Write a protein that binds this ligand. Sequence first.
Ligand code: QSD
Ligand code: CL
Length: 328
Amino acid sequence: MKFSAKRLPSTRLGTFLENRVNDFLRRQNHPESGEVTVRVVHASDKTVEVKPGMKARFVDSGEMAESFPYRTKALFAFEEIDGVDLCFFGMHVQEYGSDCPPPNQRRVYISYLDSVHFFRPKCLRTAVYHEILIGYLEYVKKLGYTTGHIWACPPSEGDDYIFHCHPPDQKIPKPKRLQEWYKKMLDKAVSERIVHDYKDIFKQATEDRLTSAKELPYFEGDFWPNVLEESIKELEQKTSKNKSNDLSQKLYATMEKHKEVFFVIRLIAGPAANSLPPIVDPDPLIPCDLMDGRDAFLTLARDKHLEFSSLRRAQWSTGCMLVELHTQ
Ligand SMILES: Cn1cc(-c2ccc(NC(=O)[C@H](NCCc3ccc(C#N)cc3)c3ccccc3)nc2)cn1
Ligand SMILES: [Cl-]
């Protein structure tokens, strides 16, 4: 096709990921694998606003910024199977640069990732997912991002993060299996000396000596900002007849209850982390309404009856997805 994955415009980030993946596959020399293309298909600037409860408590008193700028990116990976492109992996990320106020400075957060399980061969599928995620971590570490953040959260039964209508036999992993999948990825990144270490959110808070909710990173659509609003509302209902840091107390209790699902990934440790030059992303903005957040691509798939529920339909929906991205 003139409208194929390869023909999408290149980026430094996407070239870096696809090089790392195809290096890995060539080394495996499995006769069923195909070439992998990776493309960034959206990049734009955004802000995340501190919600009303935290704003009244921290923003209005001058203690915390009112909002946090970031860049969002969407990227997708494609394999050649029978000479045709199959989109098999997608990811949306938020990147908070060196200009961003604390506590968000130099952090990346994975918003959503997703897959369609037809990568060939099956036995290298997980490895390839891992290479993409490790590659992203390596890449942002080199720009000078110091910390990665993952919320391990499977989609609900019958729901789709990125790709509309998954195969009926592609199973959603249970939380513990997913948590182990991320640990396996992160142990490999640690052994390649990309990741220095990683910690659950609770342990990390304790080790950073977090004494106020304002010190907690505040991301778009993440669990912690909602938690903080519900906790402030609970606290404000309290009265006491006659004869503080109570938010912090509740945050800690909630962090401990859920610590296993929130990964804090240190990419740059020690004094190296404190003398860094400004983060400069060499890649340009990529406006693309279709891939600005997850919803627009889910809608278009529904409208045009695109489905990722078999090899043939996913190959079909990849082709139409590509048509649409050159087209728009
Ligand atoms: C019939 N039906 C299938 C689904 C369905 C099945 C699978 C998926 N998505 C994934 O498996 C996706 N896969 C991403 C790659 C991946 C593969 C295996 C494991 C494990 N363990 C972790 C990630 C994923 C995203 C976020 C969290 C967990 C999974 N999404 C939806 C919904 N309805
Ligand atoms: Cl996810």
